[PDB]
Enzyme design. Sequence first.
Site, mmCIF file in Angstrom:
data_model
loop_
_atom_site.group_PDB
_atom_site.id
_atom_site.type_symbol
_atom_site.label_atom_id
_atom_site.label_comp_id
_atom_site.label_asym_id
_atom_site.label_seq_id
_atom_site.Cartn_x
_atom_site.Cartn_y
_atom_site.Cartn_z
ATOM 1 C CG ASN A 35 -2.988 -4.773 3.210
ATOM 2 O OD1 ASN A 35 -2.928 -3.762 2.504
ATOM 3 N ND2 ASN A 35 -3.116 -4.737 4.522
ATOM 4 C CE1 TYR A 69 -4.980 3.214 6.029
ATOM 5 C CE2 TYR A 69 -7.021 3.265 4.784
ATOM 6 C CZ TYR A 69 -5.649 3.086 4.810
ATOM 7 O OH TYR A 69 -4.956 2.741 3.674
ATOM 8 C CD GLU A 78 -1.581 3.635 4.353
ATOM 9 O OE1 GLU A 78 -0.352 3.479 4.389
ATOM 10 O OE2 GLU A 78 -2.378 2.689 4.026
ATOM 11 C CE1 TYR A 80 -1.772 3.163 8.169
ATOM 12 C CE2 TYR A 80 -3.437 1.768 9.212
ATOM 13 C CZ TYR A 80 -2.510 1.989 8.216
ATOM 14 O OH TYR A 80 -2.304 1.008 7.261
ATOM 15 C CD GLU A 171 -3.997 -1.950 6.988
ATOM 16 O OE1 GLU A 171 -4.210 -0.783 7.393
ATOM 17 O OE2 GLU A 171 -3.032 -2.238 6.215
#
Length: 184
Positions: A35, A69, A78, A80, A171
């Site tokens: 990741n 993000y 978090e 997005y 990402e």
Amino acid sequence: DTTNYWQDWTDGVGTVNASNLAGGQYSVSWTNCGNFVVGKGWSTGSPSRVVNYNAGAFSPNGNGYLSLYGWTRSPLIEYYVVDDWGSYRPTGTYMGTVTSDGGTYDIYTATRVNAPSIDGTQTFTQFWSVRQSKRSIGTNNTITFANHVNAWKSHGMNLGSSWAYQIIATEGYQSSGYANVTVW
């Protein structure tokens, strides 16, 4: 309001080469990643920021995302705004839609349990806007983030009071690929 921040985070699995280029521009090449989250933007996010970008290239071979993000704390969220993806379109629990900047986005919530975060192993929440189809690549693209913030609010998806970074992020997850993006 030009960019002030460069993020080059990887879990160190596989090869991720990220370049901090002039101004708002960056590139990343990756092979068999774990990741990573690479991108440019602002060290303190704002719920009223208007973000612009042009992805000169966004070519995941497998799972990658191209998104607005960022994180908040208090509570830890978090978030997005996903404009493009590779082999996998991210989803969660459906909350509704928001129409902004020429796109219709599905809105999702999710919980991440004792998962990696900006503060290490934490249980936290994700807020998603995921475009219903992939946005054009190589075009000047605006994300009017207030539209997403206000749509999220209407579903009880209230962001935290302490703002961390806010970027146009590439990402990847267990994939290979290339991207080249300019943010402003």
